């Protein structure tokens, strides 16, 4: 139910 998650800019996905 979260409109705006906190993105990790140094994650796994390229």
């Amino acid at each position: 139910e979260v409109e705006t998650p906190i993105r990790n800019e140094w994650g796994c996905r390229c």
Partner: nanobody
Amino acid sequence: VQLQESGGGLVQTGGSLRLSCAFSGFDDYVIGWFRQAPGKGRQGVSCIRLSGGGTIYADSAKGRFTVSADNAKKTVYLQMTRLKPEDTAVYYCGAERYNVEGCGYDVAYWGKGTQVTVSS
């Protein structure tokens, strides 16, 4: 599993407030703080990984808010400072299985919410 927020109230502009989230029934869980103003969506504020205490912040939380955990007390805290009227909202704690891409993508458990109101 259970989450319960406390510490909500009325704060003067520029003031501080500390919220608590009591947790029970946990694997590698994150406790996050999310806020929702009337008729708006839920916005991620700050999250902590209970295993090791690593943290991630929304841009507006950086510097002035600190999220922390006392695993012994099974409590997570959000210490807020320099509060403004735009910070007025229901604050929720939420739990999710650790996701390296960030916080708030799959919240599995929610607290009941605590009203924070900031005015002059």
